[PDB]
């Protein structure tokens, strides 16, 4: 990406070289993961602001 | 641009800027609009 | 601010039909991209679907003719139809709106499907 550039769309992306055609699966996760914080991590991976 | 007393006057894309000349009168030009979709979608 | 209202949940019994729906009231900008998403009781929550304001539509599961998205652009929101329901899919429901600045989240509907 550029600098102070923000990515948007929410494109499904093939994660290998089995095509989404709009089916996540297998070889198919969205370029966005959901961060798991908990409180019982330790610092490293809390979550930071 | 004639108009007479169909869609003929599409859009022009704005590239990297616009240089605007007119040697008409003022009350004849009256503002301009500028976009991306020309719509809702976009301010 | 922005509120969600989000209906259409409930009891089904197994093979039924409902129909979910949220509205986006508020400061919405004009991207406006949409979706769901569910939370399985005591799992992690994934994206069912998602839809934008271009029509195009983006299915992040095997659940074609399950789910099916219509959008409404006079008041722009968004439906989802339930059919065919399988005890699979129980789990509660809150639609999505990333857009643009700020994204946002609904408060929660109860779909549950049992026999």
């Known amino acids: 990406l550029k600098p102070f550039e923000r990515d948007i769309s929410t494109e499904i992306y093939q994660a290998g070289n089995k095509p989404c055609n709009g089916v996540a699966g297998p070889n198919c996760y969205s370029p966005l993961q959901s961060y798991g914080f908990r409180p019982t991590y330790g610092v490293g991976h809390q979550p930071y602001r | 641009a004639i108009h007479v007393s169909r869609f003929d006057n599409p859009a022009l894309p704005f590239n990297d800027g616009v240089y605007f000349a007119s040697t008409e009168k003022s009350n004849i030009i009256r503002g301009w609009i500028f976009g991306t979709t020309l719509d809702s979608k976009t301010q | 601010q922005v509120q969600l209202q989000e209906s259409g949940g409930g009891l089904v019994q197994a093979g039924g039909s409902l129909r979910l729906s949220c509205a986006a009231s508020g400061s919405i900008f004009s991207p406006n991209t949409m979706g769901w998403f569910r939370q399985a009781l005591g799992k992690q929550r994934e994206g069912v679907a998602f839809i934008s304001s271009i029509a195009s539509t983006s299915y992040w599961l095997p659940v074609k003719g399950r789910f099916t998205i219509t959008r409404d652009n006079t008041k722009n929101t968004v439906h989802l139809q339930m059919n065919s329901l399988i005890p699979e899919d129980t789990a509660v429901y809150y639609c999505?709106?990333?857009?643009?600045?700020?994204?946002?989240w609904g408060q929660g509907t109860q779909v549950t499907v049992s026999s």
């Open positions: 999505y709106a990333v857009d643009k600045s700020q994204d946002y």
